[model samples]
Target: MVDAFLGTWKLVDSKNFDDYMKSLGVGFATRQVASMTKPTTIIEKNGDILTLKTHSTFKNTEISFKLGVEFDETTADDRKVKSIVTLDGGKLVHLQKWDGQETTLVRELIDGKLILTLTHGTAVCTRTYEKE
Candidate 1:
């Protein structure tokens, strides 16, 4: 299910990301830096292990996990949380929980582009990526 997402992708556009960061309680200084950073995502899979890596001028982060498994993740924003990734109808659905707060990111390949939709409370952000 993650097969379609296995490739190198560059961030092309983002929408409502600032509001999404505010909903996550990210500090203004950090958010300012994050907002200005454009990252590349490389997704790879070997058997049951799926790896997602994000490279940026601000920070780089990577995570490898099997579908339906829960793991501890220290987010780029330094939030320690429990995260799970699953495939739903060919889309990667990621859910993370920390301190009773939860967030979801759904990634889908659409029309040759990778679109990541992040949702937390009333805030939603959409980030578009072009495959390379």
Candidate 2:
């Protein structure tokens, strides 16, 4: 189901990411660096497990899990969050919670590009990625 999204992807465009970080409670200097960072995402599926890896100049993060399974993750932004990923209607829906705050990331492949929409509170960021 998620096979279409299995690929190495490079960031092509990002919008409103700095504001999204602000909604996440990120510091000023960190938000500046984060807004400048372009991350590569690698997605793979093996058996019943799926892996999502992100690499960037600042930090890297990797996670493997079965669909619908909840796990603990230390985010690239240094947030300790409870995370879960599930496929819904051809999209990968990811939810994260930390300290009574929450965020959502929805990944969808559209027009030969991967579109990732990140949301926290009233701030939203859309990042476009092309397969590598």
Candidate 3:
């Protein structure tokens, strides 16, 4: 059976977070606050459909998708094309659909950490999580 990622998760720590935010085209001021703030992730799953909610003191974002399905996404902070996430190889994969193409984002579990990988243009960002 596949691992279920349905629950609340908290951001424990990160490395190169500034670089990550910069890759997303986030402004320096927003990146400063985002780097210092810890965000909460709430995920709900029903069959192959999933909903992910990211919350923080500064901003909150929500995304819903189905395994193997493609859809549109917009971020909370800047309302930009966040990404379209799907299930691939037992891991969640994302495709950021913008500028007439799709980028990649992948989510997986490594050593008890929820790992999130984002790729756009030529930049990549990775984020890890812990259960709350």
Candidate 4:
């Protein structure tokens, strides 16, 4: 299970990068760059704690937390958010609190395929990644 999330995963493709950025209220120029950029996600796990670093040419973001631990996080756009990540049925589940609401993000690896799901503001965005 740890091997599935280790190493680096590149954003080979995405369906709604722009829409996701729009939902986050990012600026137009930033959204344009973010939509066209391919980010790399590096994940390292130590026991129940996981560190995920996402990097791109325009911006880089990282989060370090233990499973089932709730913490505060600030997005690239400077949005303050509270979130908790846990492993549910082999899938990484991220529950985020933002704008007085709760959003859920899930990540799964199946048959060598990486699947990412972000649910917020009545929108569901899905993305796929390949191991690099």
Put down candidate 3 lDDT per residue, 1-132, tens digits, no spaces. Answer: 334576888888676767756766789998888888889988888777788899999988878787666676776545456455667787887777666745576778777778877666666677788988
How do the predictions measure up, each by TM-score? 0.96, 0.95, 0.84, 0.91
lDDT of 1 by residue, 30-114 (tens): 8999999889999999999999999999999999999999999998778899999999988999999998999999999899999
Consecutive 10-residue window with the lowest summed lDDT within model 3: 75-84
**Clashes by residue pair, model 3:** none
The TM-score obtained by model 1 is 0.96
All candidates: CA RMSD (Å):
0.9, 1.0, 2.1, 1.4
Considering lDDT, where higher is better, how would the candidates rank from best to worst? Answer: 1, 2, 4, 3
Better of 2 and 3 by lDDT: 2
Give every collision pair in model 2: none
Residue-level lDDT of model 2, residues 4-77, one tens digit each, is 99989999999999889888778999888878888999999998799999998888899998889999988877
Evaluated at residue 12, the lDDT of candidate 4 is 74
Best lDDT among the predictions, by candidate number: 1
Better of 1 and 4 by TM-score: 1
For candidate 4, the 10 contiguous residues with the lowest summed lDDT are 16-25
Model 2: residues with Cα > 4 Å off, grouped in runs: none
Off by over 4 Å in 3: 1-3, 77-83
Best by TM-score: 1
- What lDDT does the true structure give each of the candidates? 0.93, 0.92, 0.74, 0.83
